[PDB]
Symmetry: C4
Subunit: 221 residues, 4 copies
């Protein structure tokens, strides 16, 4: 499977799991060329993405292979800060945006939430509509070494070492948000023990489990 069809599959999986709110959905894949990234072109939604819809652009959004969503220009900043990351996803999914609107960080209280235990930062500042510089610097510093970040009053972003892991973390974060919001009906949520959480975090992020789960999602589109 080439990276262009893996990118298109990830977009279908994101829409299949209900992670699209207009054209806010963004996905990128680190290009072999420095200061460049592969992303979805402007005006296209997640579930209508084909391999021929992802284009390579540079730091100035010059489509150097194959017009990209200009709100993805900040992706190069976090790519710069994290060489281990090859793919990024940022959407305004319903449950994750509700958590972000209430300024609520994730509370790891169930097994499927552990992939984000000690791996989901929280950026309390909502900068409005900043330039790619301010937005890119703000998220990079707040993301740190973590695999995901909840952006208050905004949504989330996932930083995966592959398109598969970024999609994996993206689907699990949104369902983690739904789970946390529903469990809130019984009052404040008690988190699980950190030692077991990290243990479950490591088991659920295994490349064999991540790869097989992604393949399962592909066959569903």
């Amino acid at each position: 499977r080439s990276y262009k069809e893996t990118l298109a599959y990830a977009c279908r999986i994101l829409a299949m799991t209900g992670q699209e709110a207009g054209l806010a959905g963004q996905i990128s894949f680190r290009s072999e060329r420095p200061n460049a990234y592969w992303t979805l072109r402007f005006g296209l939604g997640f579930d209508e993405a084909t391999p021929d819809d992802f284009i390579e652009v540079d730091r100035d959004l010059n489509t150097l292979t194959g017009m990209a969503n200009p709100a993805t220009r900040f992706h190069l900043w976090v790519y710069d800060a994290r060489p281990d990351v090859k793919s990024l996803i940022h959407t305004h999914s319903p449950w994750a945006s509700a958590l972000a609107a209430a300024r609520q960080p994730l509370v790891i209280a169930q097994m499927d939430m552990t992939p984000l235990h000690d791996d989901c930062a929280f950026l309390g500042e909502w900068p409005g509509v900043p330039i790619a510089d301010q937005e890119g610097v703000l998220i990079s510093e707040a993301l740190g070494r973590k695999r995901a970040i909840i952006l208050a009053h905004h949504g989330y972003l996932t930083a995966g070492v592959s398109i598969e892991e970024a999609t994996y973390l993206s689907v699990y974060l949104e369902r983690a948000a739904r789970m946390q919001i529903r469990a809130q009906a019984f009052g404040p949520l008690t988190p699980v023990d950190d030692a077991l959480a990290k243990e479950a975090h490591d088991y659920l992020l295994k490349p064999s489990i991540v790869g097989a789960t992604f393949d399962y999602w592909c066959r569903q589109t």
Copy 2:
């Protein structure tokens, strides 16, 4: 794209996003002739609307081109009060009606809610089943210059300068209501800063963003 197929597309987008509760859904488009508007004929739902289902009627609901939903007669009153508005949508969508049933105005707490920041009025009075005169005057005075209004114990109405902007505001209001209701689980909601909210309000209501998002929704029907 002609206005008749844009009207039919808007109805499909409204039903696609779950904004129909029986035959309560109403949509209108200002006619070139004064004291006349284009609307959907009686008995038809949103997702079964075709370009040949929208008819022109006057102040007395006389179908002067192509029987209209008589509960849309009040649309001419707000058209009279706002010459900048060319399209109107009024539905009893599930999340917006729940917000209206609880007498709850919108609290702008997330980025996708900003299109309604300082642009969503609240009519606390529910007049029951008034004549088109009383209902038209009540909503016009309460709507003011705003792009939308929550009608307590009823639903909402959007006033757009085009069918595309009315549909745009309609979809974002309903998902704003869903977001606010879900975020309420954590207690009262803290709104975002007004200066950034207006800034995000202006960016998200850009005609290029509104037009592209509408096109994306059309390709989905």
Copy 3:
């Protein structure tokens, strides 16, 4: 449209609007012969109902035209107490059952809830699994002259003067329950004024509005 296809259409509308929880769904239509009713045969769900699946049975569940769901035997008791009623629906729909599980009567707080204003009784007693005699007598006395009743720890039942009105009330009750439950997030719900509620109750239950809305739902199946 014959009554056999109207019964089958009502079942599809009930399943279309998500009102099935296993084989608990029951629908009946008063037969021309006394002490007899038309109902759906045992083992069939709502969305697989055809006109040839409704059979006439008597007080002893003897299929005298065309084996019926024996839990519908109590329908004859309420038919006896209300000669104006020709159709009955009883389901364990998700939102209405949640309201019944919490022993919560309907609070009319939105326009689409008015068809049940002063028309939805509440039976606080859950009798378990009673015989058709006890269950039939208990519901008849508690239903009174009302068009619907919430059965605590159970579900609801609608009593319509036609299959169309029973389906109409059934769909609006379930969405009334969903609306009330969601609006509860903001605290206790303030009901609308009774005078306007009865006025809206009378407008929304007009046979022309009920008939047109039913036709719209049929074209959707």
Copy 4:
């Protein structure tokens, strides 16, 4: 109907009712050979299960008929402790996992919840990612003679005397969790009387009702 197609049908019913969260879904059927069980092979989701996808494995996960999901190895432990049980289901369904994340046992407050009255244990300890020995022993001791168990911070498991009853209990538990969570909006939930609950528990778990409801679900896939 052979047991291989009954197993495949159960998986489709589980996915039809929304009981899949990645590849966490597990189903097993006791084999005629001791210390062996029939389960779904690794990497496959519930709704893509065919009769030719279930394989027989022993205590060491050696596929002795037809590679199985190794997280199902603990199924043999509970099979050992309960000879009356022939089928087991363990999923991380959304509503049941939210209940488990909040450490909330089921409160029987509605008729369709009674199949689990005095039949749903609660394991407060979440062991993380234990070996099949620890996980198998922990669940067996906590399950006892009950037909289901809520696993805190995890999900649930159902122990049925057939694939049909395990699927039956599985679907009703998840909808019981959804019902309880939604009813929580009105405050703490008052449970029904135990005598009637056990009576309704016995009526709803009748093999004729369980078998007919399973057949209805099969015709829906």
